[PDB]
Amino acid sequence: GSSGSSGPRSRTKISLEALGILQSFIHDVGLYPDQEAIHTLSAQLDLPKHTIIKFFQNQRYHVKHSGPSSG
């Protein structure tokens, strides 16, 4: 697969759970959610796509030093 998209601005307020949940999937899948995964995140959590997307973007932006392939 391969895809990307910019997303400026940032502002969210997740109690924790929801966040944590999707968070688990992130550490499971990685950092490449599909329109389907997002849909599930927007459902399971009941959050908007933009929200999930945005939030994620943050994770990506951060991740830089550490990449794929452990080590």
From Swiss-Prot:
High expression in adult brain, moderate expression in fetal brain, and weak expression in adult liver, kidney, and spinal cord and in select brain regions, including amygdala, corpus callosum, caudate nucleus, and hippocampus. Residues 8-65 bind DNA. It comes from the Eukaryota. Transmembrane segments: none annotated. It is found in: Nucleus matrix. Sumoylated by PIAS1. Sumoylation promotes nuclear localization, but represses transcription factor activity. Binds to DNA, at nuclear matrix- or scaffold-associated regions. Thought to recognize the sugar-phosphate structure of double-stranded DNA. Transcription factor controlling nuclear gene expression, by binding to matrix attachment regions (MARs) of DNA and inducing a local chromatin-loop remodeling. Acts as a docking site for several chromatin remodeling enzymes and also by recruiting corepressors (HDACs) or coactivators (HATs) directly to promoters and enhancers. It is linked to Chromosomal aberrations involving SATB2 are found in isolated cleft palate. Translocation t(2;7); translocation t(2;11). Belongs to the CUT homeobox family. Interacts with ATF4 and RUNX2; resulting in enhanced DNA binding and transactivation by these transcription factors. Interacts with PIAS1. This is DNA-binding protein SATB2. It comes from Homo sapiens. The gene is SATB2. The chain holds residues 615 to 672 of 733 of the full protein.
